[PDB]
Write a structure and sequence with these properties.
The structure is a homodimer. By secondary structure, chain A is α/β, with parallel strands linked by helices. Helices cover 41% and strands 13% of the residues of chain A. Chain A has ten helices and nine strands. In chain A, the strands form three sheets. The first copy, chain A, has a four-stranded parallel β-sheet with strand order 2-5-6-7. Chain A has a three-stranded parallel β-sheet with strand order 1-9-8, with no helix packed on it. The longest helix of chain A has 22 residues. Chain B: Acetophenone carboxylase consists of five subunits; a heterooctameric subcomplex of two alpha (Apc1), two beta (Apc2), two gamma (Apc3) and two delta (Apc4) subunits assembles with the epsilon (Apc5) subunit in an unknown stoichiometry.
């Protein structure tokens, strides 16, 4: 069995709670930084499927990592449903206008045809034939963060309906990513929402996470590194014993600690945000090599 | 169940070269530093078995390590055979006089009764009942280094006889340590000897290493981490440094680190070839217990 086939099996076992204890899988969020491989602008790379798979996979081979990030939280979810997002700079910014229907049923084909989402799905399908079998991870915007983005653009909606809408977008994205070939899914949040929204937020996480597991993909909630949220099976939670399966690191590679030994409680390590795109390709490699003991 | 039973089995598999790849066992050489647990002088600790066993075991549990070092290269072999060794400071120094008989057959009872060796054997027997089953390692002076120590004190003897003698001392010690409960043995050298002595040195390594393996204890040859990459004799488990090129897959081996904890790298990922990590010398005794704990925690990702 290949080394990456083992890591893919470890994620599928994790999705059904049948995991055996092992050293955690290091999945740093890298996107705009990878564009330095071909020296092309990041905002152009993420729009092309074939070019995306070349920069992301070749950077992974240079970094000797067992996983790559086909998608980072970058307003892709807001752009697809009708929110104004900046297209001239990376990372994209949320605008001030929106033409969104939170009550309408999600059109999966329209979702999958959004320029940056369509390119990410095409990249997954192409990486899914890599003989190294890397763990194809997709880091999405969390429901609470997505709810905030919608209201920032000017969407007026109640808490129950807007979190149901956000949960339906992520549940549809989970199926589309998993059917393309994604092995690991994560929801990135900036903070735990207000108590009045906490319940709707947990239900949106459960809805999307339940389809993820149905496709043998483990769903991870990632909160910034600097009681637990869910409790039905054994989900991977973040921040503050209990048997949580994820660990959050900061995005700055110089500040990463060593990779932990087998006995630690996590079986996965993610960065709370994408590795700074300005960071040089050589310095990122040097810090990844440091972290692995090379 | 028993965390240390798996590590002890991994060492026994290493002794017959049949190990399956796993994350390396971290065995730093720690001796005089551990004496700060009870705040007793290092030279006194190494002369009482129980005092040695509790200071080492409590530091071992404090650092969360799966192994401890009951013996460190510290002139114990030269002291036992008749070399003048300093008794007033740690680490001991080789003197300028010696009353040694290189030709005589080794007296195991006299060897095992040398104050610091008897206490190390006394500590091993007591650690052998620890329910955590740690890997009890014993780091000895290498044959070439022991040969040099004898000639530094004033022993006049030929290469063949003096390396045969050094090999008989280490072969007898290997049995005494293994029967006491040692799970890992290492021979620490400062450099590869001259070509003129290379064969005698390899034969002394084979003599001692062959009894070690017979007791299911792997014998590891440790050369300084700062030395450049070079040949590794078949008579012992190789222990290259982190910057040294990989060895052929038919040779299972260990990794050598420097003694300074601040300079240690991270512990490597699962896929690495080494089954074991040792320091080329004991961790500087002056280093504080609190700073050592922080460096071990850094190395493990805590």
């Amino acid at each position: 069995e290949a080394a990456g086939a083992l890591w893919r099996r470890r994620m599928q076992e994790l999705a059904r709670g049948a995991g055996k204890p092992h050293a955690p899988l290091f999945v740093p969020l890298i996107m705009g930084c990878a564009a330095q491989i071909e020296a092309i602008p990041a905002i152009d790379m993420v729009r092309d499927g074939t070019r995306l798979r070349k920069n992301l996979s070749e950077l992974r081979r240079m970094l000797k990592l067992d996983a790559l990030t086909c998608a980072v939280p970058s307003c892709m979810e807001a752009e697809a449903v009708g929110v104004e997002v900046s297209q001239d700079q990376w990372p994209p910014r949320i605008g001030t206008t929106a033409q969104v229907d939170v009550t309408a049923e999600i059109d999966a084909d329209r979702l999958a045809a959004s320029p940056r989402i369509a390119a990410a799905l095409d990249a997954v399908r192409q990486i899914a034939v890599d003989p190294g079998e890397p763990v194809i991870a997709a880091a999405l915007t969390g429901p609470a963060a997505l709810v905030a983005q919608l209201r920032a653009a000017g969407v007026e909606a109640g808490d129950e309906a807007i979190y149901d809408f956000a949960g339906r977008i992520l549940a549809t994205l989970a199926r589309l990513y998993a059917e393309a070939g994604v092995n690991l899914l994560s929801w990135h949040e900036a903070a735990r929402p207000a108590e009045e929204q906490d319940d709707f937020w947990k239900g949106a996480l459960g809805t999307a996470g339940n389809v993820a597991r149905f496709h043998r993909v483990p769903p991870v909630l990632v909160l910034p590194a600097s009681w637990p949220a869910q409790a039905v099976p054994c989900p991977a939670l973040n921040h503050p014993p209990v048997r949580t399966h994820a660990r959050a690191w900061a995005a700055d590679p110089a500040g990463w600690p060593c990779l932990p030994v087998e006995g630690v409680a996590e079986r996965l390590i993610l960065t709370d945000a994408e590795v700074p795109p300005e960071t040089e390709i050589a310095t990122l490699k040097a810090q990844v090599e440091r972290v692995r003991g090379e």
